[PDB]
């Protein structure tokens, strides 16, 4: 379990971002949902925050508590489990800053959102802020014929046997995996944005944030797009502290704050340089607690090579 947290301590981007937020935190209370190993939680406590309540479900928080105790941090307390099961034990129940990365691969399908919204409605002071507060999704076209060959056509013959049924399982699944730059062959399109203050609660129905948005990208070269890839960014804009704002930006092909997700287009889309790949992204949350999501994608060429439109429904799961 310890090794799984190394990525966090080497995340320079998040560290400088949340450090910019934790400048004005002295004397203010912090609620860190999904604190993980509690590195940012402890940095907030080290920033002389009045109180820091760090919550996560993994056992690492227990080790985090030990570390906190062994570093003289006395204004921080860790809680293991879902927020709903620990609020009753909370020392304080009104916070000035709530740090939570509630954004999923499609903006609305991270289980932590259900907890963020609870903290927004009950545990946030009148003038308190939440960090980050906005998230946009970006679409790009991807051309990886060999990856398709190695994940789909691979099942065409396995040691002499055809495993066609597996191809379905491959194409119905949203692939979370870094996509090489050489495979990015289109511009980027910001399709949708959500803000924590506008996000609807999910305790009654999980669909109150489902969205259908168009998108359009332009091929950067003569190519054939057989994958659509989705990147997530995050923004924090504090009107009271404008300088403390940050952006966990998106850079396809490079280091990103989240691993992009990809969907395999059932029919490749051949494009000329500059040709528009237009489409539509439909995202529906079915289970907030497990992040179960359906992603319906329509994508089409503009006709320079050939008029093609392809549709596909894909399934994503967190737990």
């Amino acid at each position: 379990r310890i090794s799984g947290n190394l990525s966090c301590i080497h995340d320079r981007v998040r560290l400088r971002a949340y450090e910019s937020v934790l400048r004005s935190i002295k004397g203010k209370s912090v609620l860190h949902l999904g604190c993980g190993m509690g590195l940012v939680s402890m940095i907030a406590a080290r920033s002389l925050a009045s109180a820091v309540v760090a919550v996560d479900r993994s056992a690492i928080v227990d080790a985090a508590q030990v570390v906190a105790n062994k570093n003289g941090l006395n204004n921080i307390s860790f809680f293991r489990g879902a927020l709903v099961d620990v609020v009753q034990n909370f020392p304080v129940r009104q916070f000035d800053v709530i740090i939570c990365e509630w954004m999923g691969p499609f903006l609305i399908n991270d289980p932590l959102l259900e907890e963020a919204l609870y903290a927004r409605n009950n545990l946030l002071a009148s003038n308190g802020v939440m960090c980050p507060d906005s998230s946009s999704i970006h679409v790009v076209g991807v051309s990886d014929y060999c990856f398709h060959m190695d994940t789909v056509e691979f099942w065409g013959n396995v040691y002499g046997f055809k495993m066609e049924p597996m191809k379905a399982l491959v194409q119905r699944e949203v692939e979370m995996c870094r996509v090489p730059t050489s495979s990015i062959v289109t511009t980027t399109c910001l399709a949708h944005t959500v803000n924590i203050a506008s996000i609807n609660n999910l305790d009654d129905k999980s669909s109150l944030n489902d969205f259908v948005v168009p998108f359009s990208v332009r091929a950067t070269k003569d190519t054939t797009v057989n994958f659509l890839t989705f990147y997530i960014d995050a923004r924090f804009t504090n009107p009271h502290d404008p300088g403390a704002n940050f952006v966990l930006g998106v850079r396809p092909g490079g280091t990103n704050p989240w691993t992009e997700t990809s969907v395999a287009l059932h029919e490749p889309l051949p494009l000329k340089g500059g040709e528009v790949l237009s489409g539509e992204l439909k995202v529906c949350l079915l289970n907030p607690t497990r992040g179960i999501t359906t992603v319906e994608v329509t994508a089409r060429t503009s006709g320079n090579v050939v008029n093609i439109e392809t549709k596909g429904t894909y399934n994503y799961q967190r737990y």
Partner: protein, 317 residues
């Protein structure tokens, strides 16, 4: 139940050594399968069931408690083995068969050979479902161990916790020693003879034997030789047949998907060429969690550069 996803099955099937080891074990001994009943314990996509059918088996029973059984049943049909291979969706412990099976094929091996392994299930099948002389594929399992130098990961996975943004995470460093590392050990890292850790006869082993003690000696070879960790690998010989095939996860062979299991010593051994260090390892299922492994390691080393006699524990969870 994570086997209902395609990633794990693709990884195992693209493990050429693993799958071809089973294939060739059956196909170089096809005479062993003629007119025989084969049980594929954990058939997954059905690959091994089809190897057995293609080897000449009269009846193959692939059992798998995952939804992949559905796809397996379809795959079996797509290649014409519908009337030879039967795919059952369920636990091998909770299923009953018409006949006793003559051969049991299974890729039950986990990391460290026994972590999250189906060996208890295979033994259950052997005893309750297999003939008295049922043949196991594989029928032998040997674990081996050797010392390795790993300055890279000692600095990037343990000492990295000494200071993290001006905070002392030494506790994380101490906790890292509890959990073995599943990763590939390079030949250049082996600074020691491969010693036999333990051997199991799958035809005769009992669950109680899997909680094993082992006493092995490691001799430094080829001027300060650091044994930063113990690389544990295994091989599973298929000795049931006339032609012997051996699935091997040794670092001296190209990596499999099991790679190797690395037990990082709390106190690395500072040895010289020729010096020997004795070890006593006890592996046992974890008391509360049945599928977790407790590993106790006694290190006794006396050399020109160090004298250390200590006990260390690992927990594969």
């Amino acid at each position: 139940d994570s086997y209902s996803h395609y990633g794990i099955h693709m990884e195992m099937l693209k493990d050429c050594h693993r799958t071809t080891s089973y294939r060739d074990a059956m196909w170089r001994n096809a005479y062993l399968f003629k007119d025989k009943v084969v049980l594929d314990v954990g058939c997954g996509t059905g690959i091994l069931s089809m190897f057995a059918a293609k080897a000449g088996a009269r009846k193959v029973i692939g059992v798998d408690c995952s939804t992949v059984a559905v796809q397996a049943r379809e795959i079996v049909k797509d290649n014409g083995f519908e009337d030879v291979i039967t795919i059952i969706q369920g636990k091998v412990e909770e299923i009953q068969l018409d006949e006793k099976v003559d051969i049991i094929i299974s890729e039950w091996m986990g990391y460290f050979l026994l972590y999250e392994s189906m060996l208890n299930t295979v033994l259950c099948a052997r005893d309750n479902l297999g003939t008295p002389d049922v043949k196991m594929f594989p029928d032998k399992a040997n674990m081996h161990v050797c010392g390795i130098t790993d300055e890279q990961y000692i600095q990037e996975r343990f000492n990295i916790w000494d200071n993290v943004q001006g905070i002392d995470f030494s506790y994380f460093k101490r906790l890292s020693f509890i959990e073995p590392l599943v990763d590939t050990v390079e030949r250049s890292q082996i600074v020691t003879n491969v010693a036999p850790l333990v051997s199991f006869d799958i035809n005769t082993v009992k669950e109680a034997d899997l909680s094993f003690t082992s006493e092995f000696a490691l001799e430094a070879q080829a001027s300060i030789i650091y044994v930063h960790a113990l690389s544990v690998h295994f091989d599973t010989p298929f000795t049931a047949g006339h032609e012997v095939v051996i699935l091997d996860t040794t670092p001296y062979s190209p990596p499999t998907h099991w790679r190797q299991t690395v037990l990082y010593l709390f106190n690395p051994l500072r040895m010289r060429a020729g010096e020997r260090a004795t070890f006593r390892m006890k592996c046992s299922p974890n008391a509360l969690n049945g599928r977790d492994l407790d590993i106790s390691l006694h290190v006794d080393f006396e050399g020109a550069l160090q004298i250390s006699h200590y006990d260390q524990d690992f927990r594969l969870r």
